[PDB]
Amino acid sequence: DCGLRPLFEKKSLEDKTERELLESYIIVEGSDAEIGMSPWQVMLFRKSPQELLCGASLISDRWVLTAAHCLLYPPWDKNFTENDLLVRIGKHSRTRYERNIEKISMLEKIYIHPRYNWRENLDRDIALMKLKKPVAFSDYIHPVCLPDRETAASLLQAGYKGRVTGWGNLKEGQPSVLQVVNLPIVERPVCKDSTRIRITDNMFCAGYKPDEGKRGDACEGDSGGPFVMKSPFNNRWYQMGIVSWGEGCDRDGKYGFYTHVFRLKKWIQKVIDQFG
């Protein structure tokens, strides 16, 4: 039942900008999300001090997907463990404890890709989090789908738009509520020529070209969040990427980079079934 939102697909209601996504299948400069617009959005929360660490996504009732740099990043002496964090699901407001709406969960085990490259380019920036006890779904809590080879093949094309959400910085003030932005996928060549960093097959970049007029991007605080796309074949939402890295936010001639989820699905499958 993944990818079908209780307040939208299930009632046959379209959200305010999904049409932009569908019409393309031929957070900075974003906007407030609608209630129940991204029921898989998860907030990585630090106990002490109490603070927003990153975004993440709900892929089942027991598993959360995020960027490995949110948990381990030696250059900044960052190396969190299960007991240092809290996962908050069902949120809209960034700072308010949404009583009766959100659910807070504890972690049982963190799994970081064994080949995550924090030394150079955040290659394989991905991590899975096993919650202690299953979260119950509701109108505001529902998992996103992981893509299969076919879906990945037909959707991950330059020009096709995806959607990014998060409570991170609005400029390079934090938002009051969850922000949302739709961005086009960019050609590898262009991604490669916009930076000095070595780009691998495990990444993809998104954002508007400087001449495209429209703009927008992820920013600090957004890390680990999902880049999703709506399949025009079965109407479900699939997570194609994980907000990973950028050099600035919404810089002209620059683009945000994302972890290519499909390329790493074998590791994801492996873990989930080997550890429940």
Binding site: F45, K47, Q50, E51, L52, L86, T95, R96, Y97, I104, M106
Partner: peptide, 11 residues
Amino acid sequence: DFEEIPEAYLA
């Protein structure tokens, strides 16, 4: 500016 969450989760 985070609102205090219930201690039951902090434990």
